Write a protein that binds this ligand. Structure first.
Ligand SMILES: O=c1ccn2c(n1)O[C@H]1[C@H](O)[C@@H](CO)O[C@H]12
Ligand SMILES: O=c1ccn2c(n1)O[C@H]1[C@H](O)[C@@H](CO)O[C@H]12
Ligand SMILES: O=c1ccn2c(n1)O[C@H]1[C@H](O)[C@@H](CO)O[C@H]12
Ligand SMILES: O=c1ccn2c(n1)O[C@H]1[C@H](O)[C@@H](CO)O[C@H]12
Ligand SMILES: O=c1ccn2c(n1)O[C@H]1[C@H](O)[C@@H](CO)O[C@H]12
Ligand SMILES: O=c1ccn2c(n1)O[C@H]1[C@H](O)[C@@H](CO)O[C@H]12
Ligand SMILES: [Cl-]
Ligand SMILES: [Cl-]
Ligand SMILES: [Mg+2]
Ligand code: NA
Ligand code: NA
Ligand code: NA
Lengths: 251, 251, 251, 252, 251, 252
């Protein structure tokens, strides 16, 4: 029993029902090596797939690529193969002055600035995490000693105009997104990323458990470049946190 | 000093920063009498306002009326007078067969089938509660001995067509809402009500903490009529739960 | 055959096919006492219901609460009990400099800034009164000696941001409503209220006759504060006008 | 002199007119104008034929619009530039209610905005409604002609074919948006279809101009029977008598 | 047989499967006289219809009137009578400084600022010409010696606010269209007209081949007033170009 | 110098390239680059593998995009920052018309915008259409290869599954918006589904960049026949031959 993109069978997952889903294929092996008995399964396109064992239970680690479309394929195919719980770990840009580089954010809902979420539920439907996953992520993040923020994330199909960046080839932002960063800031939105609206909407409308946790790598209100050591520490802590959140989800 | 509709002053609230907001004016005194030193403040239109004390802290109880528009006035005016945390307690119709009459539901996100939410944030923005409020409501519900569900609520500007009821004067439902109850059922939505989309969107986009907990009074999938005793116990338990959730928020 | 919310039966209405529907429950007895043989029927939540006799014919008076959602329940349940004609009487904020406190407005169409209207007809459908009701209301208003304006009303699900009020807790108005009062003023819109779009859409799309008349209590463009006397005269004239408009509708 | 882009007339040509009658068909302009005093041809360009005439001593314009909101919006704007403030549309319509007969008249109280041009003047939320004095005058003139008159909502479509849910077409298909739409409008009490009122009424109600629409019923989508030639000819004559009498009510 | 508006039969078209569709009824005879054996068929409302012969093959010439609605009727009815290819020739306002009066524009796609296109395909569908038509129009326009621009056209249901003209009776443009001309300019749109979105969408979605070619009669960005000779030469070249494009389409 | 956020290359690395070939799959980048002169690996990060090569003496970039508009939009933007002005997409597609066979090629003339990223560049009304020179070059190159070539509209979806109306899925459900959609596109003459052209074409047409899309048909949603290995291998080889010849036509 096979899937179109991921290159793995149900047997290859050794009964896993929980997946950790980073964006970058190069992070998959790093996450898997935090657990026991990491095994490389497949790599094709942006999809690198490992298995490992956590407290004796099989866990998948599968990259998604950037954006909702590639994410939606990985989630669907993993679900076909028995996965029911999806933990997303990644990086994010904060838009609130109070949020520091190196803090962690657990998304409580996403602003749906994507398209793929609409392929699962109409816009009125909330891009919300599973409560148990969000609770596990907050606990794992806080137990690590990180400063943790719970709140709304703006989830964009673009890095550039949808995050209201003007330092671009055209220097233009379409009307819809002009003044948008200030609006989200005034509404209390914490951060930008590019996958949570699709992931959370698709899972919450499909009987799958999902959540998102991210390390803050930049703050759009601070012009200074963050410290290399702080970025290193943040990346390392983010993947230790998601594995501890996975531990808390196991039954 | 004063507000347009609620007929109270900041001084009347004796420093309260938390409000319990039922819909029915007649339930305000019932909630207030579970706390210490309940005092009637005002009644105008659908807005009945009491003050009380919980663990030595002032707490407001204010009715909202039915629907997002009247709710939005109460929340705004209370926020002008210093309230920052809003706990909604109410009744709901379940639409999932596994949810029984007498169970409780804590909303993790709302389907925005309202209008007033759009006066605070565009449709993309998620109608989600404050995570600490949702956590406190879950804990208080569980500690009451209730069966508790966390999940998505469909929040409608109408009782009739927007809940896909056909036993009406015209017997017609507009195209938008034809087949909608089955759509939400298949997407895992737990229940219908008429205020959470407005409340959660307004508060999440305005720096206010909000959540919603409800007792299930009917299940749209079950022919059995619930008896008077189970209904009476459900309304009593709901208001005990919301006051214990308030205690957890003030702690 | 006792309706869900209003607490009355078809028999209670003694054959009435016309209702006067103010917003405030406290105004119901005042309007009923302008007619013969006023009788209190029920009070639950924002719904106070009286019956009276006008030229020997039974007339209902029923409050709606603030907003389309609570209005839509009252209209539906009255229609279930045989009511076919709905006369709304209310207060309003004028937005045109030529409209004075104490004038009366008869709505010829509403700007649909609500949500509940969409639960009856798609946005393309006009929120239009019944021509006979509008004609009766104009005649009653003019015969009273009032200065009467016929025109478009902006009908908002909120009192605050949807009427472009900035004197609020956050002082923020969402993009959709920023600059909206000037836009409506430049398009000749007379006034703001919160129910007519729902009422007129639901009735025009359901085989029910409806209209709206209002006394002006404030003008958003005038700095002067109206005196207590003028406002009292205005409230009194508004309810005398709606009863005379009811007399003109009786067959 | 004051000129306009499309209509080919000047403000002076209108001799002080503040009221226009606006049929769709250029060939109907002279027919309306000859019911008044001193009709004079002013100009014809594209679908816009323009006459002046006099009604109870006051100047009146008669100007065709062509089919559809876009061409109508040009005529209204340019007439407004030249001092016209009141616009009375007369036309033909298909009824969709079984109780409305061929030969009846409909005065529109509001339009379903199934157009595009209305959105160039006001967002969809804004009501496509007539000026109350114009509708009142139209109703009175229609009743006084002996016609059976209906007041109600009109569905105003940018197409004759799919937007009126016609299937007897080249493709036989109707886009999803319009599938089931005639039954929907029928159940909502809509009286009739036409192609200009949403644009006209929205444009005018949002621009300080007084507008209304009155129409003779030429077909009923629910009746298999073919109307006879006589009934149709009588209907077209009575419609233009009615709109001129409505104009008379508006001028005094 | 016959059709509702155009006043012609299939036999009247003597086998024609290609139509040239100008807007102005007065231009029909001019275009037909560029071909052999022009014959007047009918005139009703804005629809003047002629048939002619091009390289021995029958060609229809039929005016559309201004706007998508009247265009949509002509196209439908011609299609009922066997026409499959539609060549629009017209005038246009350039909005780019590099486009001169006398140049020719062949539309490669239209901005759908119309309503009638939506009656054939949802907004996501592209208002795109048939590739063979566009190729033929490019070749004919270049062979004439004109300077030819291939690109996007903004297709508006109005001449005034939808082209962001302020020199109007009210001097107002609705919010949707404020700043729109600069937006289209920055997006590289070449010109405005009023029919292409409807024509291209209806044909591309209905199995019919369509394209648009236009002579530039004015440039919104240039101060120079085109002289009488250049405008007369441009109108003349435009119709010679469309007939040569028709020649290229004949099989 | 300056190095962009994601692609890990500098302007100098591109040796003056103003044209990029942008496949989806990183593994296809070297395969395209080796059909040209002096291919050199530049960088690999995430789904972005970047080579340079020379075609008729001129520098050409080859850069993978990943699946979907979002990751595509990043690659196009960053290449444009580094001087690229022309973008040629080559990929695979599922045909939805019975007349289109596995092994045919499709050149998109316009895309149905069933994506989200296109809206971050232009509102929905704006057409997702290719540069006419690119589409012309792609047609010519495809015909010259011996392929059967179709010009027409492509449905461009943010999903592989529900947005292409697939029911053989974990839930077996398709959201209301997409129920019936494949028949709807079929009856409107749409040729095929893919996942990037709406974003690419809208982004470039609204930003002063020239773009086009050509694809080899790997499946037909209306056919039960399973395509054989040899036909699929020949299709993939021909597609990349075609895009390089189209590039040669663009540089000429
Ligand atoms: O503002 C940001 C900052 C980091 N990310 C982000 N947006 O989106 C995620 C993309 O996968 C990718 C875009 O670089 O990494 C994540
Ligand atoms: O399906 C239901 C069941 C109970 N409620 C509801 N919907 O909405 C709440 C309204 O305020 C009011 C409507 O009766 O009570 C709550
Ligand atoms: O601007 C105004 C002025 C008066 N009203 C109004 N808006 O809406 C009506 C609400 O029911 C309620 C809001 O106070 O009273 C009416
Ligand atoms: O169903 C109908 C019946 C008559 N009309 C109509 N729709 O719209 C008007 C068009 O201008 C034109 C279309 O034939 O005439 C009017
Ligand atoms: O800006 C312009 C310039 C010329 N046209 C135009 N817009 O639209 C076409 C209309 O049919 C009509 C509007 O005058 O002529 C064409
Ligand atoms: O129906 C199809 C068939 C092939 N593709 C597709 N849709 O979209 C392209 C995706 O990048 C990826 C999805 O497999 O490959 C292309
Ligand atoms: Cl939170
Ligand atoms: Cl084509
Ligand atoms: Mg102040
Ligand atoms: Na209420
Ligand atoms: Na026309
Ligand atoms: Na990707």
């Amino acid at each position: 029993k096979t899937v179109f993109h991921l290159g793995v069978t149900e047997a290859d997952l050794n009964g896993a029902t929980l997946a950790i889903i980073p964006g970058d294929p190069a992070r998959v092996q790093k996450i898997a090596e935090l657990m026991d008995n990491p095994v490389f399964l497949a790599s094709h396109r942006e999809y690198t797939v490992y298995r490992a064992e956590l407290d004796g239970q099989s866990v998948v680690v599968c990259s998604t690529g950037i954006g909702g479309p590639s994410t939606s394929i990985a989630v669907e195919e993993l679900a076909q193969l028995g996965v029911r719980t999806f933990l997303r770990v990644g990086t994010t840009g904060a838009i609130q002055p109070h949020v520091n580089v190196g803090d962690m954010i657990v998304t409580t809902g996403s602003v749906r600035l994507d398209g793929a979420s609409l392929h699962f539920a109409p816009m009125e439907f909330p891009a919300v995490p599973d409560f148990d996953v969000a609770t596990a992520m907050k606990a794992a993040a806080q137990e690590s000693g990180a400063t943790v923020h719970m709140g709304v994330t703006a989830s964009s199909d673009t890095f550039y105009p949808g995050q209201e960046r003007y330092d671009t080839f055209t220097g233009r932002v379409v009307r819809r997104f002009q003044g948008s960063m200030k609006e989200w800031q005034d509404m209390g939105v914490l951060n930008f990323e590019m996958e949570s609206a699709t992931l959370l909407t698709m899972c919450a409308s499909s009987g799958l458990k999902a959540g998102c946790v991210a390390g803050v790598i930049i703050n759009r209100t601070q012009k200074e470049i963050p410290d290399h050591a702080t970025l290193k520490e943040t990346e390392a802590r983010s993947i230790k946190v998601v594995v501890e959140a996975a531990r808390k989800m196991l039954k």
